[PDB]
């Protein structure tokens, strides 16, 4: 088949930058050459075909370049809701269909602190001989965060998840979940149930808590 | 214009499972139309294409001998028969439209239908809230214990989607699926407004309203 490779493999950069990616065919395609947008969680968007020429509606800061083997694709002022995943894709020749391996695109942002926020079991969950509890950290910046429980100011360990949202597409922050999970008899043998934070934006660890009652 | 699937959910290794796309919108029997798949966090991988009369058909090869792309322009559909899946085979299909100029290419796609390779079965979710307590306040809705993915959540019934996180789910240990979906609020609005979390899981047909309070 015709490989297409893309370069860089992910990149981090500012509001209002000019960003360049690069695709690359293995042999000559001319001008086929159609490139993608993924915004997290959404379908891909079609941005432009024949190297350079933008689909209708697409915003005028996308613009294309190359011919043969080397192309290019520049933003000329990034802009929050442009992260995500860009492919760029051949059709000089089917089958197969071929798309690059795609390119991740990340806004770098001032750093922002995590509003912490923690949440009992409910009753109605407590019936089903099962307590979760979670601690949320809120539209924070870098992605990076440490979150620990304690219970009776006891350290928990493997008895917890996390989730990390993919970065929002208008504030450029971050969001995470932990959910400590224990049995309802393990649940109501303590008291003090708590989540540290620990990030960047906090000079000092913060301790979000409750007693159980 | 507007493509909109089915069929997606569980499938046992080596049985069969069949995808549906149908279309409204536009002159379906004009455009040829593509099968495109992604693995989690993965890129995107083309599986199958089917001519606009349905006479030419091509495919991937590691799906050669395995998978049927079919059509029917008077029902505006178009199909993806999945036979002896693989784990592999575990990803999101989008089907996408396409037409002859070269195929231009992919202008318009589904919204994707999960499909997982898995002995486990279909399980519901039960949907626990997350209560807001003690300028900002945040509440949210547990959905915990289902398979397979996805589930789908809204805020009083698509009216409230500022400051809304639904987290990706995690995978439990019991092998059941878990997650969260969480808004902030302002603390003088609780008591005062509504807040319901609506959550749907289309593979076990489970449709739950909760009503979260302080």
């Known amino acids: 088949d015709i490989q297409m490779t893309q370069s860089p493999s992910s990149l981090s950069a500012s509001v209002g930058d000019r960003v360049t990616i690069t695709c690359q065919a293995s042999?000559?395609?001319?001008?086929?050459l159609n490139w993608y947008h993924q915004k997290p969680g959404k379908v891909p968007e079609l941005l432009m075909h024949?190297?350079?020429n933008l689909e209708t509606g697409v915003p005028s800061r996308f613009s294309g370049r190359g011919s043969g083997t080397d192309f290019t694709l520049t933003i000329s002022s990034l802009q929050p809701e442009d992260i995500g995943t860009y492919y760029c894709?051949?059709?000089?020749?089917?089958?197969?269909?071929?798309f690059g391996g795609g390119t991740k695109v990340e806004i770098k942002r001032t750093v922002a602190a995590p509003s912490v926020f923690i949440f009992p079991p409910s009753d109605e969950q407590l019936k089903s001989g099962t307590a979760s509890v979670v601690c949320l950290l809120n539209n924070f910046y870098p992605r990076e965060a440490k979150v620990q429980w304690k219970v009776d100011n006891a350290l928990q360990s493997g008895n917890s998840q996390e989730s990390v949202t993919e970065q929002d597409s208008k504030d450029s922050t971050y969001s995470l979940s932990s959910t400590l999970t224990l049995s309802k008899a393990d649940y109501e043998k303590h008291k003090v149930y708590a989540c540290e934070v620990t990030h960047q934006g906090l000079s000092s660890p913060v301790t979000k808590s409750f007693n159980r009652g | 214009v507007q493509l909109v699937e089915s069929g997606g959910g569980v499938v046992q290794p080596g049985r069969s499972l069949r995808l549906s796309c149908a279309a409204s919108?536009?002159?379906?029997?004009?455009?040829?139309m593509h099968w495109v798949r992604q693995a989690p966090g993965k890129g995107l991988e083309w599986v199958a294409v089917?001519?606009?009369?349905?006479?030419?058909?091509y495919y991937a090869d590691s799906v050669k001998g395995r998978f049927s792309i079919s059509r029917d322009n008077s029902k505006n559909t178009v199909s993806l028969q999945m036979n002896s899946l693989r784990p592999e085979d575990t990803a999101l299909y989008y089907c996408?439209?396409?037409?002859?100029?070269?195929?231009?290419?992919?202008?318009?796609w589904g919204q994707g239908a999960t499909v997982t390779v898995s002995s486990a079965s279909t399980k519901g979710p039960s949907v626990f809230p997350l209560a807001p307590s003690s300028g900002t306040a945040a509440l949210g809705c547990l959905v915990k214990d289902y398979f397979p993915e996805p589930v789908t959540v809204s805020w009083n019934s698509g009216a409230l989607t500022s400051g809304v996180h639904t987290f990706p789910a995690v995978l439990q240990s019991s092998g059941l699926y878990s997650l969260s979906s969480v808004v902030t609020v302002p603390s003088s609005s609780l008591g005062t407004q509504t807040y319901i979390c609506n959550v749907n899981h289309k593979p076990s047909n489970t449709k739950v309203d909760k009503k979260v309070e302080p």
């Open positions: 024949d190297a350079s």
């Open positions: 919108g536009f002159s379906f029997s004009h455009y040829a």
């Open positions: 894709q051949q059709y000089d020749n089917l089958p197969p269909l071929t």
């Open positions: 089917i001519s606009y009369d349905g006479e030419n058909t």
């Open positions: 042999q000559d395609i001319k001008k086929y």
């Open positions: 996408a439209r396409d037409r002859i100029v070269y195929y231009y290419g992919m202008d318009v």
